[PDB]
Every structure is written in structure tokens, then in C-alpha cells.
Amino acid sequence: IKEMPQPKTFGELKNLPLLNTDKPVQALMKIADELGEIFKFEAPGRVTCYLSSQRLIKEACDESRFDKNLSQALKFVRDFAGDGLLTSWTHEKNWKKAHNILLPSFSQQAMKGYHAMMVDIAVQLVQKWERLNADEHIEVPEDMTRLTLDTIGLCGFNYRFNSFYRDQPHPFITSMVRALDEAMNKLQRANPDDPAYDENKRQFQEDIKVMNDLVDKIIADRKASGEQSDDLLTHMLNGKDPETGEPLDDENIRYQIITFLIAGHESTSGLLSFALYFLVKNPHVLQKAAEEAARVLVDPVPSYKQVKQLKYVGMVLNEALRLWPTAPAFSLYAKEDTVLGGEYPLEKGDELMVLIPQLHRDKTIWGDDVEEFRPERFENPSAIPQHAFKPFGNGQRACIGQQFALHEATLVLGMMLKHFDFEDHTNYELDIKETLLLKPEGFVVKAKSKKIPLGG
Numbered sequence: 001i002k003e004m005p006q007p008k009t010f011g012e013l014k015n016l017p018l019l020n021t022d023k024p025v026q027a028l029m030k031i032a033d034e035l036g037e038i039f040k041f042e043a044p045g046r047v048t049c050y051l052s053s054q055r056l057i058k059e060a061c062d063e064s065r066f067d068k069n070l071s072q073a074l075k076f077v078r079d080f081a082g083d084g085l086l087t088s089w090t091h092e093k094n095w096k097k098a099h100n101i102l103l104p105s106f107s108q109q110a111m112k113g114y115h116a117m118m119v120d121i122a123v124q125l126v127q128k129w130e131r132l133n134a135d136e137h138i139e140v141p142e143d144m145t146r147l148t149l150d151t152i153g154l155c156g157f158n159y160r161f162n163s164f165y166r167d168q169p170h171p172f173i174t175s176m177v178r179a180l181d182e183a184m185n186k187l188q189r190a191n192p193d194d195p196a197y198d199e200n201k202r203q204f205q206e207d208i209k210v211m212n213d214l215v216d217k218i219i220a221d222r223k224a225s226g227e228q229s230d231d232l233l234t235h236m237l238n239g240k241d242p243e244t245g246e247p248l249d250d251e252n253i254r255y256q257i258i259t260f261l262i263a264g265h266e267s268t269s270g271l272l273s274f275a276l277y278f279l280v281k282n283p284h285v286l287q288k289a290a291e292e293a294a295r296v297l298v299d300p301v302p303s304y305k306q307v308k309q310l311k312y313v314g315m316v317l318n319e320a321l322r323l324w325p326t327a328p329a330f331s332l333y334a335k336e337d338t339v340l341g342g343e344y345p346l347e348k349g350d351e352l353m354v355l356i357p358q359l360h361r362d363k364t365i366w367g368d369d370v371e372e373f374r375p376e377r378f379e380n381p382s383a384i385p386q387h388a389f390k391p392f393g394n395g396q397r398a399c400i401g402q403q404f405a406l407h408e409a410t411l412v413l414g415m416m417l418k419h420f421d422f423e424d425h426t427n428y429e430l431d432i433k434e435t436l437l438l439k440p441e442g443f444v445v446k447a448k449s450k451k452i453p454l455g456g
């Protein structure tokens with residue numbers, strides 16, 4: 001039984017002066033390098049505990065002792081994501097019900113049905129880049145976000161945002177992105193009911209009606225035609241919880257649709273952008289990956305089977321997730337009084353954060369060279385110690401989109417590698433912007449086409 005390690009406290013400010021940054025996760029990582037696998041963090045009126053070692057994180061992942069907590073971010077996101085799967089407590093009736101209904105629609109098998117729609121958008125991306133003039137360049141996260149949003153839109157509810165036809169995004173995306181940005185901004189707002197934020201709260205209400213109006217209209221449209229589809233909306237309209245026997249109601253269906261867009265777009269865009277960041281910085285890995293892509297992707301458009309044979313591209317994406325998991329933290333609470341790691345007593349309801357980028361640099365698990373980009377670490381996934389690699393969270397509250405995200409990213413990165421050579425023409429210095437997610441801000445490349453025809 002030990003006192004919990006903790007950074008210096010500064011009077012009433014507690015540990016807050018140590019996070020005077022718009023990159024708190026990276027600052028927290030530096031604090032963990034100093035204090036080790038657990039420290040307590042205090043701010044005026046809040047206390048949390050940050051875990052970074054596999055040894056402790058494997059205890060935190062025992063679901064009989066700790067359940068998912070809604071961070072303050074998730075709470076503010078709940079004002080428009082409602083009781084969709086991401087922003088619900090595990091005890092909510094609609095959590096268990098939407099989970100049981102939705103899980104078969106997110107399985108590896110189910111990816112066979114979304115494949116044609118993911119290729120549709122992936123071809124539009126390849127075509128965009130094929131059509132650039134020499135001397136133009138690519139804005140990487142901006143184009144990955146066009147792709148992921150359009151793919152979730154199409155696979156999710158057969159709606160085309162048509163992001164590659166636009167300078168200014170579709171109104172629904174604008175409202176969604178501004179809603180998220182407002183929810184993030186609220187976290188560091190000292191005088192929230194001040195008059196200066198009345199414009200903020202009106203705009204926030206406008207963006208919610210825009211999102212709701214569109215999604216309610218498409219749901220009602222679909223119920224009136226009876227059209228069936230290869231989309232998640234179809235499954236939610238037809239599905240019944242095997243446990244209660246009930247279906248989702250229209251309002252919850254709307255929240256799940258908004259939730260897929262929130263949960264899937266930025267996180268999957270980051271994963272593709274970081275993977276392409278590490279490849280252009282490690283030309284020898286880029287060549288090995290491009291060699292796989294040429295060997296495997298023999299038809300003008302990839303089959304589902306082919307995507308599954310892209311094992312090295314898969315390793316690349318897992319190593320990008322090791323170094324910079326794009327959702328860098330998830331929050332947990334103690335369900336009852338407990339002792340963590342035989343040393344730290346926790347009281348019922350105490351909060352823990354899992355600092356995933358630090359977890360992923362546990363030298364006792366990964367070897368001393370943790371900063372190096374080595375996809376080969378993932379050659380044999382079953383040999384990786386249990387709970388060492390957690391970019392998709394944990395247990396029943398893990399990412400339901402994991403197979404969808406991975407299949408999407410493998411497909412797209414395999415086609416990028418097949419069709420283009422890449423140049424890091426600005427010698428880009430990694431700049432990791434933090435919102436709810438990580439992304440390599442300002443990352444730009446040039447792509448030189450290999451002149452390989454696409455398909456019907």
C-alpha cells in the first residue's frame with residue numbers, strides 16, 4: 001500500500017499549470033515519462049488517475065471491477081449524439097439494446113456487404129489524385145476526412161455527402177464539425193454563462209436542428225418507401241434485440257447514425273494520415289508495403305478477399321495505431337472499492353484514464369526502441385501480451401467500428417500504394433493537433449501516378 005505518485009501541485013491551481021497547452025495528451029505523456037505507470041492528476045474540482053503500463057491497464061480492463069466513464073467531452077457531445085452507443089452509460093437500456101442489435105452488422109463477415117460502397121468512395125479519392133496537375137499537392141488529413149465521412153454516409157444510411165465535388169462541405173458536415181468544436185471548446189471555458197457565448201449557444205442549437213432535420217428526414221423517407229439496402233439504416237429498421245425482442249425507435253436510430261459519423265470519421269481519417277505520414281518518413285517500409293499492394297491488388301478494383309490478403313498494410317496500420325492511437329484515451333470508473341495493482345486503494349466511483357500512446361510505449365512489452373516505426377512488431381499478433389495494444393478501447397465498450405475502420409483503411413491504403421508513388425515535398429515536421437482525436441496537422445504530400453487503370 002503506497003501513496004499515489006503525483007506531479008507538483010501549485011496551491012489552489014493543483015496540477016493545472018502543468019497542462020498550459022492545447023496538446024494535453026502529449027503533455028501527459030511527458031508527465032508519465034517522469035512519474036511512471038500511474039499518477040494522480042488534480043485540477044480545481046476534479047481528480048483523476050492516469051495509467052500507462054500494461055501491468056496496471058490489464059487490471060483496469062477487468063469489467064467486473066471497472067466500467068466505461070463518460071468524460072466531460074463525451075458529456076458535452078451527448079447533447080447531439082444522445083443515447084447512441086458512444087455517449088451512453090453501460091447501464092442505459094438503449095446501450096444494451098443498440099449493442100445487441102448492431103454487433104452482427106459490424107462483424108468481419110458484415111464487411112463483405114459494405115465492401116462495394118467503400119470501393120465506390122475509395123475510387124473517387126484515387127480519381128481525385130489522378131486528376132491533379134503536376135505541381136499541385138495533396139492535403140492528407142483533409143482528403144482522408146472527405147473519404148471517411150462519405151464512406152460512413154453511404155454505408156451507414158445510403159446518403160451521398162459528395163465531399164469530392166465540393167470546396168465547402170455539405171451543410172450537415174459543417175454543422176457536425178462546428179458542433180464537435182463547440183463541445184471541445186466548452187471544456188476550457190472559464191465564464192460559460194457570460195454574454196460573449198450567446199452567439200456560441202444559438203449556433204450550437206442551429207447545428208443540432210440541422211443534423212436532426214437531415215437524419216430524421218432520411219429515416220422517415222426510408223420507412224415510407226420500404227426500400228431495403230446494404231446499409232446500417234436497413235439493419236436498424238429491421239433489427240430486434242434478441243434479449244428484449246424490441247427494435248430501436250426512430251429517435252435512437254437517428255442518434256446512432258449521428259454517432260457513426262462522429263465516432264468513425266475523424267478517428268479513421270487520422271489513422272490513414274498517420275500511416276501515410278510514417279510511410280513517407282520510412283521509404284523502405286513504404287516500398288515493402290507498395291510491393292505487397294502490387295502483388296495482391298491484381299484486378300482493376302480490389303475484391304474483399306484481396307483486402308484480407310494485405311497483411312503488411314494491416315501491420316503498417318497497427319504500427320501507426322501503436323505510436324499515435326487516434327483516439328488517445330478512454331475513461332473508466334471503479335464500480336466498487338478496490339485495490340489497484342496490490343498497492344493503490346480506489347474508492348467506488350473514482351476515475352481512471354488509460355493513456356494509450358504511453359501504454360503503447362511500455363518498454364517491458366515492446367523492447368527499448370519504442371519510438372521506431374516497425375510494422376514487423378505485428379507479424380504475429382497472438383504473441384502480443386494481453387491488453388498491451390488498446391487503440392480500440394476495451395471489452396463490451398470497445399469500438400464497435402473496429403472491423404469497418406480497418407477494412408476501410410486497408411483497402412484505401414492498399415489502393416494509394418498501388419496507384420501512386422509519394423514524395424514528402426515539404427519535409428513535413430509532425431504537428432499533432434488534439435481535438436477529441438489526434439491528427440497530423442498540415443501534413444501535405446505530392447503523388448506521382450503509376451498510370452495503372454481503374455475498373456468498372
Ligand code: HEM
Pocket residue numbers: 068085086087099152259260263264265267268271325326327329330331391392393394396397398399400401402404405406
Ligand atoms: C481506426 C479508427 C478508430 C479508432 C482508433 C476508434 C477508437 C475507439 C475507441 C478508443 C472507443 C472507446 C471509447 C470510450 O471508451 O469512451 C471507440 C468506441 C466506439 N466507436 Fe470507434 N474507433 C475508430 C473507428 C470507428 C468507426 C469507423 C466507427 C463506426 C462506423 C466507430 C464507432 C464507434 C462506436 C459506435 C463506439 C461506442 C461503442 C460502444 O460503446 O458500444 N469507430 N472507438
